[PDB]
Amino acid sequence: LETFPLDVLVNTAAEDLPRGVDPSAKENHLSDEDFKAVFGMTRSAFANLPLWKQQNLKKEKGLF
Structure with missing residues (x-):
C-alpha cells in the first residue's frame, strides 16, 4: 500500500495519479x-457509512 500527501491526492490530474492509488x-x-x-x-x-455517503463526503473534500 502506497500513501501520499493529502495535497497530492486532491490536486493531481487523473492521468498523473500515482499508479499505486485506487x-x-x-x-x-x-x-x-x-x-x-x-x-x-x-x-x-x-x-x-453507505457508499454514496462516503462518496458525497469525499466530493467536497476533493477526494472523489
Whole structure:
C-alpha cells in the first residue's frame, strides 16, 4: 500500500495519479494522520457509512 500527501491526492490530474492509488478509494492512501484530520472518524466507521455517503463526503473534500 502506497500513501501520499493529502495535497497530492486532491490536486493531481487523473492521468498523473500515482499508479499505486485506487482513484475510487483515495482515502485508503492517506496516512492515518491525514485520514483522521480529513474525516474525523476511524477508517472502520467511514467504511461503515453507505457508499454514496462516503462518496458525497469525499466530493467536497476533493477526494472523489
